[PDB]
Design a protein around this ligand. Structure first.
Ligand SMILES: Cc1cc2c(cc1C)N(C[C@H](O)[C@H](O)[C@H](O)COP(=O)(O)OP(=O)(O)OC[C@H]1O[C@@H](n3cnc4c(N)ncnc43)[C@H](O)[C@@H]1O)c1[nH]c(=O)[nH]c(=O)c1N2
Length: 452
DNA sequence: ATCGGCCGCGCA
DNA sequence: TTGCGCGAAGCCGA
């Protein structure tokens, strides 16, 4: 392995027990530097390796959609892990408390976890550390270049980062060694329970039939690769030319998978790098899964207040501040955005996409978020509403990409200043009639007339 | 260090 | 739609 992928959280004396992978971000058996390094740590100690996963009360914040998607992936995983002689454990409760006392009851010798920049994982690590005595290691198994090596600071923009990332690629774009099995050694309750809790929340139509359409993305690792293979076969060729067209389905659709870690962007890059297509579409594509995915981890990592206004740049703040007192053309409540009840049938279209399919088109996520700012009573409330709805309804929600992209949208983060307007100040602008020139908006709107 | 280099709209 | 030069605007980094 490349040792720069490991960062020791806590130094201690190794016990003669198992090596415990605390799986959290990367829910896949294959192409997992964290599970691979736990195996290795467990090989040269003549100890087994085990995976432990903590199911927290964070599901009641979102929807059945994300909760099945994650719990069906887990159920596949369990078989995969088990076929490698790796037992996998499922703790119901609070990582800080639960993993600690688990490390206790099993006499773990070493503790490993994947990397994730979201505030709450630092809280749980920091509590975990304060209650164990064995080494605690962290591995970046989500980014091609570990987040702390691509950049030490907050990168102001894509092209300040892009050079630093691309110097390090020859060294970190490597092949994955295969998970060598162990030599020595209840999820269906958890599903049916958690579903009965979420059920009063489900998004129904005027009739009981649920809004959510689950047949657009199957969960799991096996699914995730048939999406990557199909992309490379079918859509990668035209990606750079038709990605901004919400009517052609040319996106890679891999983002529900990556969020849950059911597939490795490192594998995707390896596979794309070796595919033969339009160079500009590889170039377009690598830049999203390479520069924009990982600058998003950098954003949350180096700015703990990423889900708030303060993390904007001083020009964006100063600008939005001066237009706090402007007269909003319209003002809608959260409930009114949430139900696609604005004057903008194109905007209600996109929210209709988000509502029923669980994934809004990459281009329309920009428009949808800017109009939220334009038609709310304050930037803070606009952030508050874009965050809530992105996370409540998007299958890829609750993700660094999420905050890094609402922050681009509402706040200039990783962007520049444009001509000054009412309400929006100097934040980039998007218009109905700018979409008219780029794609058949009449056709998007027709797709989604599920407003009942 | 000094300066290039990151949507909307007219027009053909 | 389909591409281009132009516009408004701030700041990094070489
Ligand atoms: C308002 C708003 C809200 C969100 C987001 C953007 C905006 C403007 N994003 C980011 C982006 O819009 C999203 O990754 C794509 O819609 C994912 O669809 P595909 O995987 O099909 O992208 P596509 O195949 O075109 O891109 C490939 C990959 O590049 C990365 N990427 C693309 N666009 C990016 C962006 N703008 N920022 C960061 N990484 C990017 C992702 O890893 C994506 O899987 C996001 N993404 C996400 O997964 N979860 C979320 O909750 C949000 N939230």
């Amino acid at each position: 392995m490349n040792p720069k992928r490991i960062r020791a959280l806590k130094s201690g004396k190794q016990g003669d027990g198992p090596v415990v992978y605390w799986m959290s971000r990367d829910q896949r058996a294959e192409d997992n530097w964290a599970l691979l390094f736990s195996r290795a740590i467990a090989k040269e100690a003549n100890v087994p390796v085990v995976v432990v996963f903590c199911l927290t009360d964070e599901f009641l914040e979102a929807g059945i959609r994300q909760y099945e998607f994650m719990l069906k992936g887990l159920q596949e995983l369990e078989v995969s892990l088990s076929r490698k002689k790796i037992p996998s454990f499922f703790l119901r409760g609070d990582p800080g408390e639960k993993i600690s006392r688990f490390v206790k009851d099993y006499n773990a010798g070493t503790l490993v976890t994947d990397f994730s920049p979201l505030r709450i994982k630092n809280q749980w690590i920091e509590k975990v550390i304060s209650g164990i005595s064995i080494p605690f290691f962290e591995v970046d198994a989500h980014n091609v270049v570990p987040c702390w090596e691509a950049s030490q600071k907050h990168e102001y923009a894509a092209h300040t980062f892009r050079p630093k990332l691309y110097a390090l690629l020859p060294e970190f774009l490597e092949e994955f060694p295969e998970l060598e099995p162990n030599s020595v050694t209840t999820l269906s309750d958890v599903l049916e329970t958690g579903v009965k809790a979420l059920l009063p929340e489900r998004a129904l139509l005027k009739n009981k039939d649920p809004l959510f359409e689950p047949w657009h993305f199957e969960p799991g690792e096996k699914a995730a690769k048939k999406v990557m293979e199909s992309f490379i076969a079918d859509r990668l060729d035209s990606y750079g030319a038709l990605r901004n067209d919400p009517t052609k389905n040319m996106l890679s659709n891999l983002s529900p998978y990556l969020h849950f870690g059911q597939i490795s962007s490192q594998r995707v890059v390896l596979e794309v790098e070796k595919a033969e297509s339009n160079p500009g579409s590889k170039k377009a594509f690598l830049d999203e899964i390479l520069i924009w995915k990982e600058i998003s981890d950098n954003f949350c990592y180096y700015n703990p207040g990423y889900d708030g206004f303060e993390s904007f740049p001083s020009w964006a703040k100063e600008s939005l501040n001066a237009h706090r007192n402007d007269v909003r053309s319209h003002i809608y409540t959260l409930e009114e955005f949430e139900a696609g009840k604005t004057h903008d049938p194109l905007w209600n279209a996109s929210q209709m996409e988000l509502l029923s399919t669980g994934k809004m088109h990459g281009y329309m996520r920009m428009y949808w978020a800017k109009k939220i700012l334009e038609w709310s009573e304050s930037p803070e409330k606009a952030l508050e509403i874009a965050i809530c709805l992105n996370d409540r309804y998007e299958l890829d929600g609750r993700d660094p990409n999420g905050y890094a992209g609402i922050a681009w949208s509402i706040g200039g983060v990783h962007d520049r200043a444009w001509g000054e307007r009412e309400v929006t100040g100097k934040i980039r602008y998007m218009s109905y009639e700018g979409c008219k020139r780029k794609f058949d908006v009449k056709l998007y709107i027709e797709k989604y007339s599920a407003l009942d």
